[PDB]
Amino acid sequence: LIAAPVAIGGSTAALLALGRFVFLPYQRRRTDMEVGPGRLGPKTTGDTFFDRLQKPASFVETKSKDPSGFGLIDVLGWGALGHVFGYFLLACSSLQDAGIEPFPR
Amino acid sequence: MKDFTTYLSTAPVVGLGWAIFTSGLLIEINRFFPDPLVFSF
Amino acid sequence: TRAGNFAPGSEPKDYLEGLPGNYNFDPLELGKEKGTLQRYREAELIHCRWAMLGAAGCLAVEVLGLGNWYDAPLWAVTGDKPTWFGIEVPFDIATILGVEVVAMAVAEGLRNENQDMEKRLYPGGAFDPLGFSKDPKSFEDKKLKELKNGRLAMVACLGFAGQHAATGKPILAALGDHLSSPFFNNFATNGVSVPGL
Amino acid sequence: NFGIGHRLEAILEAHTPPAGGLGAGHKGLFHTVNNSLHFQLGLALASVGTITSLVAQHMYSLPPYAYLAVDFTT
Amino acid sequence: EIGPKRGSLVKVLRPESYWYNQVGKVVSVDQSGIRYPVVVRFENQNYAGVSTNNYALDEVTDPP
Amino acid sequence: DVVQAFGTPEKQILIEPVFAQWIQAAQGKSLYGFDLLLASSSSPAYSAGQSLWLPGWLEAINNNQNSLFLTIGP
Amino acid sequence: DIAGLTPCSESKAYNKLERKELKVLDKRLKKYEPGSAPYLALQATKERTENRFKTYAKQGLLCGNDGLPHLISDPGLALRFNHAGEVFIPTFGFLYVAGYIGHVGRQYIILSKEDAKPTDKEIILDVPLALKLAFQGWAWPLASIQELRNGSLLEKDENITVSPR
Amino acid sequence: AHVVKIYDTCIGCTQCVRACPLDVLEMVPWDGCKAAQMASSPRTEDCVGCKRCETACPTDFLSVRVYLGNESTRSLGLAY
Amino acid sequence: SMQGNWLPGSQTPAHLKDLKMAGNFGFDPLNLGAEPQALRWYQQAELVHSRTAMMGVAGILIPGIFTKLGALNVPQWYEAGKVYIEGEGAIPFGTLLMTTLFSYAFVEGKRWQDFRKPGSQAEPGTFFGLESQFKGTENGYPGGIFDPLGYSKTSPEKLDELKLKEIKNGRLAMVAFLGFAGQYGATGKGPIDNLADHLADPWHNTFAENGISVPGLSAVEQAAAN
Numbered sequence A: 001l002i003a004a005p006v007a008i009g010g011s012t013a014a015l016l017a018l019g020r021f022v023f024l025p026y027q028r029r030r031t032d033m034e035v036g037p038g039r040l041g042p043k044t045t046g047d048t049f050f051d052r053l054q055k056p057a058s059f060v061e062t063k064s065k066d067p068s069g070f071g072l073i074d075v076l077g078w079g080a081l082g083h084v085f086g087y088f089l090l091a092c093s094s095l096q097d098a099g100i101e102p103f104p105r
Numbered sequence B: 001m002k003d004f005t006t007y008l009s010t011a012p013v014v015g016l017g018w019a020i021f022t023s024g025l026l027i028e029i030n031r032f033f034p035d036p037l038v039f040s041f
Numbered sequence C: 001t002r003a004g005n006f007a008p009g010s011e012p013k014d015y016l017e018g019l020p021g022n023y024n025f026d027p028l029e030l031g032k033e034k035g036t037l038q039r040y041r042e043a044e045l046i047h048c049r050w051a052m053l054g055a056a057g058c059l060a061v062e063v064l065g066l067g068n069w070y071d072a073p074l075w076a077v078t079g080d081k082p083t084w085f086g087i088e089v090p091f092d093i094a095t096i097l098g099v100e101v102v103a104m105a106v107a108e109g110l111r112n113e114n115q116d117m118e119k120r121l122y123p124g125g126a127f128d129p130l131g132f133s134k135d136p137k138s139f140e141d142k143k144l145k146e147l148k149n150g151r152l153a154m155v156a157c158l159g160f161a162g163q164h165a166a167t168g169k170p171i172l173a174a175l176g177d178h179l180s181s182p183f184f185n186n187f188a189t190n191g192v193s194v195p196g197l
Numbered sequence D: 001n002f003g004i005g006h007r008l009e010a011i012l013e014a015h016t017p018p019a020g021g022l023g024a025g026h027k028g029l030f031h032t033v034n035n036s037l038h039f040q041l042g043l044a045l046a047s048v049g050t051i052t053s054l055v056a057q058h059m060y061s062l063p064p065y066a067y068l069a070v071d072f073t074t
Numbered sequence E: 001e002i003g004p005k006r007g008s009l010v011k012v013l014r015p016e017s018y019w020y021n022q023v024g025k026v027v028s029v030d031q032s033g034i035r036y037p038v039v040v041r042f043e044n045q046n047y048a049g050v051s052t053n054n055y056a057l058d059e060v061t062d063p064p
Numbered sequence F: 001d002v003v004q005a006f007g008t009p010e011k012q013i014l015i016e017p018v019f020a021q022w023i024q025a026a027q028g029k030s031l032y033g034f035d036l037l038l039a040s041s042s043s044p045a046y047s048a049g050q051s052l053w054l055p056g057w058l059e060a061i062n063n064n065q066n067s068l069f070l071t072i073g074p
Numbered sequence G: 001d002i003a004g005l006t007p008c009s010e011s012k013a014y015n016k017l018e019r020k021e022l023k024v025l026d027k028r029l030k031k032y033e034p035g036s037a038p039y040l041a042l043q044a045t046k047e048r049t050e051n052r053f054k055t056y057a058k059q060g061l062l063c064g065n066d067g068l069p070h071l072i073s074d075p076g077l078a079l080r081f082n083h084a085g086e087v088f089i090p091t092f093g094f095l096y097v098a099g100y101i102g103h104v105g106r107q108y109i110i111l112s113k114e115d116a117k118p119t120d121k122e123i124i125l126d127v128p129l130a131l132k133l134a135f136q137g138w139a140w141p142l143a144s145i146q147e148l149r150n151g152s153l154l155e156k157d158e159n160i161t162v163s164p165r
Numbered sequence H: 001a002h003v004v005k006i007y008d009t010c011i012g013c014t015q016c017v018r019a020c021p022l023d024v025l026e027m028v029p030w031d032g033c034k035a036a037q038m039a040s041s042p043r044t045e046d047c048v049g050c051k052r053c054e055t056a057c058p059t060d061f062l063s064v065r066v067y068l069g070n071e072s073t074r075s076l077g078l079a080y
Numbered sequence I: 001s002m003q004g005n006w007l008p009g010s011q012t013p014a015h016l017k018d019l020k021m022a023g024n025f026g027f028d029p030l031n032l033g034a035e036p037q038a039l040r041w042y043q044q045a046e047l048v049h050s051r052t053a054m055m056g057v058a059g060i061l062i063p064g065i066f067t068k069l070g071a072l073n074v075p076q077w078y079e080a081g082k083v084y085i086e087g088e089g090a091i092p093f094g095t096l097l098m099t100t101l102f103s104y105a106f107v108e109g110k111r112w113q114d115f116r117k118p119g120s121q122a123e124p125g126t127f128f129g130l131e132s133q134f135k136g137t138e139n140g141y142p143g144g145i146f147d148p149l150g151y152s153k154t155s156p157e158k159l160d161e162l163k164l165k166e167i168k169n170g171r172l173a174m175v176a177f178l179g180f181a182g183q184y185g186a187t188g189k190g191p192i193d194n195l196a197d198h199l200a201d202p203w204h205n206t207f208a209e210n211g212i213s214v215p216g217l218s219a220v221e222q223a224a225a226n
């Protein structure tokens, strides 16, 4: 069945470690060619209340205290990936130990 | 005959001669041979 | 530096000049405008190595008589212990899946941040323990190599997959069949290789 | 507003095939779709009509409601 | 003098003209400095039924 | 229609829909006899999902009373 | 025996349709004397019906659940099974004549457009040149292929009337 | 009423003013054509949009253009 | 140059009046050879069709002649395929067809690359060093090991006389094989048996008496007999 705490924890630790030490240099390069200095950049320009909603948030650029660029939003996203992968593995184990074989024979 | 054969090279050479030839041709294939469905030579 | 011609008398294509393993291949002018040609080279130079590893694994499980390559990923089904080189592996299927999907992830991730084409193709340095790439003439000689045997490796992997797709037999047994009666045991005699036999 | 996500203009301008297969590709199409309300209306109506056709072709063969297949006229 | 030779075939590049990317024969080129001095004649009529039209100097080129 | 008018309905061109019948047999319809995947027990597509939804889908698609993938003629 | 269709020779509904046609044709035979021209015409019709039913059978023909012969359209399935004669060869048989007509029309169009006031040649046809092209169009695919290869088949858009969008 | 506009492609054949049975068009002196004439539409509000001037126009495309819209009691040809 | 005429009094095409060719008789009413490279490709196609027609027709005739003489029991060509298929020590049909297709694809790619680029098969160090003699003398006339008896490196007069003879026997063999196919299709017997029937009984054994060749002729003969 696989123990759900150890499976979820291992999956989210692996995903967070990947997102910090591995794909973080690959990340923000897509943003340099997406919303970079010479690219499209700002989504909106106007200065009314319905335009400040499209303006970027205030807690996403505060130079998070991690040595890398791993902010709170990246932590949430990679933890969501880890929870997704852990639940996928647990779901596959649940289908396996019920006597049902989804794989081709 | 020159004036007549200039007229005869207008619309009836393509509207009648081709029509009669292709028609009567196909009539005689459908007559001498019976109705086919499969091309088995 | 041209190795040869895939068709004797072909038109000389100028965008393939100087590349390692240079035949006058690519009829369809793929990667002619440079750019993706570098992507094509950096993708072929690792597809070759992966097919080399796979066909080496199949040949090692065959000629040492330790199993069949198609029957090798069958320990996950029916729940018996995995064996490598005869020795039983104490690991678990979930564990091996975890280490594989994180190890290949970190490998390709640190591979992806080279940011220079020459090291992306041929890293060297830490990827050169014995260091036979120091001599540039031997470097070009070994670059012409591993591509010929690499392309042959890719063709061999496709052949292994296709041979076990039609006839469910070990590849060594099929080789013995073609050695024994080649005119009776070939690709045209298995039935499902060409329609209409 | 957060730092992560995808930009539609970046995806549209990036998907330009090499060797001039589609010329400029989808370059300059984000402003064309956004500024023109009729483009969005036509796309929405195309998808809605196609999926209504899909709903019609999938309701009769796979009835999701109990005793719907018995009611022939319905 | 300032336009193509009289009687020479020219190609019309005017987009709104019926004879866009077509070949016409020059019949006269006006030398008084008017908006469309080049006068050409086409073997095929338009939908209005005319066969001649006037174009500027930049709207006519030699066909290949 | 003119062939049926002349009292000889066997002379009409009846092109059998081989493509869609082949597709239906690929989905598990055993009426046409094409022993393709999802209709043969040795195919990997039939084995994959053999215990998930295949006994329901095959039973529903091999029954001509329902409207699921009706038999189609010329 | 493909697509759940029985052969025409071993079909019960095919024979039922045949005997029904024979019965309705022999119904009209009782109202004429045997030595009459309508009787001879009806006998010829019955003989043609019997010949058609005989020739449609044992000719690689199948019919299913209706007694009416069916045609197999997918090539390959018409190759391994003896069904190419249904649509496979007659496809090229039609296409040869269609390319013949298109090629002789194209030849007449080019050979007329190079003539002074060429608009009259479409309403005033010439018979010797059209018949010469008519008996020169047997090798239409070779001529079309060589014209495509040398570029004279197509024309530069630069010289094609284009809508100004 | 409708909008009638004359472009510089006009060459002063002065037949668009004959084909208009409403005295919408007029011929003014010009210098951009050999005939030194140009169509002008002072009484544009009297036009109904019958496009007879466009029929009479020999230039390709049409030098005089009539655009429909904003119908009135005179542009609708109403005697009541 | 211009040798003979396929039809005396016919207007010979302008591309055949002053053209140096083997067996040029002015026979191109459809003007398929007006373009020069077109004529080169058609000449090569005629040469390969004619040469394989020599091989095929010789296989029809010489075993058939020896069977008529009683030397060998080799059957006629139309059932020889079934005879070998039903044999004991027989390579299967699929293997034979695929081997034939592979070898012919290889040699025809060689000939094709000779055609598009002349003498391009003589690229040094490409075919085991023996490709130095793979240079083509002319379209459809490669030479090299294809003339191992040295019967072509002489004066041009016997050379183009031999080319004319080759194209004549090749056209004859092509019409002969079309005849073999047709006279199996109609009579259902071997060509040697058909020749024996025509020699022993010419009037009652012909294409007209057989109803397959000209349908409706048998009905005409039966109506005229009654």
Ligand code: CLA
Residues within 6 Å of the ligand: C030, C036, C039, D014, D015, D016, D017, D018, D020, D021, D022, D025
């Ligand atoms: C193995 C090599 C390879 C191959 C085969 C492809 C193949 C493709 N790439 Mg490409 N690509 C490659 C390598 C390759 N890529 C590499 C290495 C890179 C760099 C990383 C890219 C970067 C790249 C970009 C950036 C884009 C592509 C795109 C495409 C697609 C369209 C190509 C094109 O020009 O349109 C085909 C050429 C045409 C002229 C189009 C003609 C279409 C006709 C007119 C329509 C006919 C309609 C017809 C009536 C339909 C009938 C159907 C019936 C049911 C009615 C195509 C699937 C594009 C894509 O994603 O599109 C899917 C795209 O934007 N590629």
Ligand code: CLA
Residues within 6 Å of the ligand: B026, B029, B030, B034, B035, B036, B037, F002, F003, F011, F012, F013, G097
């Ligand atoms: C596009 C749709 C379509 C198609 C595919 C067909 C196809 C067919 N129909 Mg149908 N039909 C159609 C439309 C169509 N028809 C319409 C619109 C009508 C109403 C007017 C009919 C009415 C109709 C009737 C009433 C009958 C048919 C029949 C036929 C068959 C014709 C077979 C034949 O004559 O022998 C094959 C014919 C040929 C090979 C013709 C020869 C022409 C080629 C080019 C050879 C050239 C001749 C010659 C050798 C040239 C050289 C010499 C020359 C230079 C002088 C075939 C199954 C008949 C049949 O058999 O029923 C099954 C039949 O009884 N149809």
Ligand code: CLA
Residues within 6 Å of the ligand: G101, G102, G103, G104, G105, G106, G108, G130, G131, G133, G134
């Ligand atoms: C022989 C001359 C000729 C040729 C080569 C073509 C070729 C073409 N036409 Mg055109 N067409 C023609 C005559 C011709 N057409 C005539 C006379 C008409 C008026 C009825 C049309 C009406 C027409 C339409 C409305 C359309 C085409 C389309 C097409 C294309 C599809 C192929 C096809 O079969 O279309 C089908 C063609 C027809 C249904 C027309 C059949 C009319 C007969 C067969 C032509 C008779 C010409 C005559 C025999 C030539 C004289 C011979 C000479 C020896 C004296 C192709 C580019 C289609 C297209 O744009 O696709 C790209 C399309 O939508 N054509």
Ligand SMILES: CC(/C=C/C=C(C)/C=C/[C@@]12O[C@]1(C)C[C@@H](O)CC2(C)C)=C\C=C\C=C(C)\C=C\C=C(C)\C=C\[C@@]12O[C@]1(C)C[C@@H](O)CC2(C)C
Residues within 6 Å of the ligand: C025, C026, C027, C028, C029, C030, C047, C048, C050, C051, C053, C054, C055, C056, C057, C058, C068, C069, C070, C071, C072, C073, C154, C155, C157, C158
């Ligand atoms: C065939 C192939 C590539 C073919 C490419 C071709 C034809 C290219 C086509 C073109 O040239 C043309 C025609 C014409 C040109 O104009 C265009 C291009 C596009 C250039 C790659 C295979 C590539 C094959 C690869 C990478 C194989 C990898 C294998 C692995 C990893 C194996 C692992 C295992 O086998 C073990 C060891 C043991 C088992 O028990 C378990 C498993 C897991 C199965």
Ligand SMILES: CC1=C(/C=C/C(C)=C/C=C\C(C)=C/C=C/C=C(C)\C=C\C=C(C)\C=C\C2=C(C)CCCC2(C)C)C(C)(C)CCC1
Residues within 6 Å of the ligand: A012, A075, A076, A077, A078, A079, A080, A083, A084, A085, A087
């Ligand atoms: C500070 C620090 C640290 C730590 C860290 C941490 C602790 C973090 C956090 C956290 C974590 C550790 C995690 C996170 C996560 C997040 C998120 C955000 C998640 C999410 C999830 C989800 C979203 C889910 C979903 C679902 C559901 C709901 C159900 C069903 C299934 C699914 C999956 C679908 C360390 C020591 C390392 C180092 C030093 C510093």
